[PDB]
Paper text:
MHC-I is a cell surface glycoprotein that is responsible for the presentation of both endogenously and exogenously invading pathogen-derived peptide antigens for immune surveillance. Peptides anchor the antigen binding groove (ABG) via interactions between peptide residues and pockets, denoted A–F. Polymorphisms alter the stereo- and electrochemical environment of the pockets, dictating their ability to accommodate different peptide residues, thereby influencing the nature and quantity of the bound peptides (4–6). The key residues, residues at positions 99 and 156 (residues 99 and 156), adopted two distinguishing manners to alter the peptide binding plasticity of SLA-I molecules, and their molecular mechanisms were further demonstrated by the corresponding crystal structures.
To clearly understand the mechanism of the R156A mutation affecting peptide binding, the crystals of pSLA-1*04:01 and pSLA-1*04:01 (R156A) were both solved with the same peptide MTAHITVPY derived from FMDV (MY9 in short). The two structures, pSLA-1*04:01MY9 and pSLA-1*04:01 (R156A)MY9, were determined in the C121 and P1211 space groups with resolutions of 2.0 Å and 1.8 Å, respectively. However, a comparison of the main chain structure of the peptide (root-mean-square deviation (RMSD) = 1.172 Å) showed a significant difference in the central region of the P5, P6, and P7 residues, which are recognized by TCR. In pSLA-1*04:01MY9, 156Arg formed a hydrogen bond with P4-His, but in pSLA-1*04:01 (R156A)MY9, 155Arg interacted with P4-His. In pSLA-1*04:01 (R156A)MY9, 70Thr on the opposite side of the groove provided a hydrogen bond to the main chain of P5-Ile, resulting in the middle section of the MY9 peptide being pulled toward the α1 helix. Compared with 156Arg, 156Ala made the D pocket of SLA-1*04:01 (R156A) larger and more hydrophobic than that of SLA-1*04:01. The space volumes of the D pockets of SLA-1*04:01 and SLA-1*04:01 (R156A) were 26 and 52 Å3, respectively. This explained why SLA-1*04:01 (R156A) preferred to bind to hydrophobic P3 residues, regardless of the size of their sidechain. Moreover, 156Ala did not change the negatively charged characteristics of the entire D pocket, probably because of the surrounding amino acids such as 155Arg, so SLA-1*04:01 (R156A) could still bind P3 acidic residues. The change in the nature of the D pocket caused by the R156A mutation was the structural basis of SLA-1*04:01(R156A) binding more peptides than SLA-1*04:01.
Author numbering:
A (entry chain B): 3 to 100
B (entry chain A): 1 to 275
C (entry chain C): 1 to 9
Write the structure that this text describes.
């Protein structure tokens, strides 16, 4: 059985424009483990770290993809997930009010 | 709750690359402290927090040798289960294991576990008494017969009652500043007008450890519990966690609502109120 | 520290 990923996108600290911060895309609950997670800045892929593959007590996998960033007023951030359960990639926009 | 040491193994067959990938992660409580990934440069057990870096080279050497042999066993294991299930060689499959020990008040094992899943479904597990196994299907019954003939349950029990809790107790000492001194949440409430007759209040808890926490909303005494949207607790990126809980309230009243925060890092439950 | 996990499936 294949389980689709759940996706949260958020900053490590409360976002304030001009102040350096960290952008997180937490992807969880999925199976099989093959997955492609990209943080996007204005639609374009960012360089980011990805955590070591781990899984929850129900066997479903989770990964954290993160990079440093400095939010401003104009730039739009999102995280885009591809997985066998998804016909089209799942895109979650970053909202500083999460 | 009781402290724990746990390892999480994921083996994935990769016929497109001619091999299998094996990853191991180790946790003390909610803290990942080691990893192994045989698709990474020079596959080995590697540190993932500062406090384990005080282990000497023989520690790393033994962990690396041991996990390399496990990856070998799991590569053949993926081969073997594919045969048990009459499956073709072209597809990728997953073999997972998790095992670990919880620390009792005497420094001995409180309870421990060892469990497997194949392709995301339970396959075999060590029972609560650490002396017997439960097989999910006819395939895992084959594995069960092999492990019984090899007295694997005694090997498991010994590990869980011995090396596992002893290593746990040592790690708890080395990482005391984070593993045994809880970091309390940083808390604030934000306000979002959301409709003519509703304002959204969001109670944030940020940067806390361990990950267990309680956030609830209460208007003058009674707990709101039909629809206060609460996100799954999520990692901050620095080894701490964050969560929020939000509810919609009438514009007449925001001051009358109280967010209550329970966490081990707070000597006493915290209250937060308006925006 | 990890367990000795090498008994075949």
């Amino acid at each position: 059985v294949a389980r689709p990923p759940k996706v949260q996108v958020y900053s490590r600290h409360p976002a304030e424009n001009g102040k350096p911060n960290y952008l997180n895309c937490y992807v969880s609950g999925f199976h099989p483990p093959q997955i492609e997670i990209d943080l996007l800045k204005n639609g374009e892929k960012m360089n980011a770290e990805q955590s070591d593959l781990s899984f929850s007590k129900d066997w479903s996998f989770y990964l954290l993809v993160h990079t440093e960033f400095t939010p401003n007023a104009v730039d739009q951030y999102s995280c885009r997930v591809k997985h066998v359960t998804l016909d089209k990639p799942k895109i979650v926009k970053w909202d500083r009010d999460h | 709750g009781p402290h724990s040491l746990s390892y999480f193994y994921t083996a994935v067959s990769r016929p497109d690359r001619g091999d299998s990938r094996f990853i191991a992660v180790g946790y003390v409580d909610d803290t990942q402290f080691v990893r192994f990934d045989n698709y990474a440069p020079n596959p080995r057990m590697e540190p993932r927090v500062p406090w384990i870096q005080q282990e000497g080279q023989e520690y790393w050497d033994r962990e690396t040798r041991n996990v390399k042999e496990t990856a070998q066993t799991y590569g053949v294991g993926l081969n073997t289960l594919r045969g048990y299930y009459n499956q073709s060689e072209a597809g990728s499959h997953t073999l997972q294991s998790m095992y670990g020990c919880y620390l009792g008040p005497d420094g001995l094992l409180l309870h421990g576990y060892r469990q497997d899943a194949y392709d995301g479904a339970d396959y075999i597990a060590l029972n609560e008494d650490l002396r017997s196994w439960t097989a999910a299907d006819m395939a895992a019954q084959i594995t069960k017969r092999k492990w019984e003939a090899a007295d694997e349950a005694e090997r498991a029990r010994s590990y869980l009652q011995g090396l596992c809790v002893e290593s746990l107790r040592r790690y708890l000492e080395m990482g005391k500043d984070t593993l045994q001194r809880a970091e309390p949440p940083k808390t604030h409430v934000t306000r979002h007008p959301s409709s003519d007759l509703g304002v959204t209040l969001r109670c944030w808890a940020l940067g806390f450890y361990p990950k267990e926490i309680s956030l609830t909303w209460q208007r003058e005494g009674q707990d709101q519990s039909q629809d206060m949207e609460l996100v799954e607790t999520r990692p901050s990126g620095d080894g701490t966690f964050q969560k929020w809980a939000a509810l919609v309230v009438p514009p007449g009243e925001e001051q009358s609502y109280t967010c209550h925060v329970q966490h081990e890092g707070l000597q006493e439950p915290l209250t937060l109120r308006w925006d | 520290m990890t367990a000795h996990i090498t008994v075949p499936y």
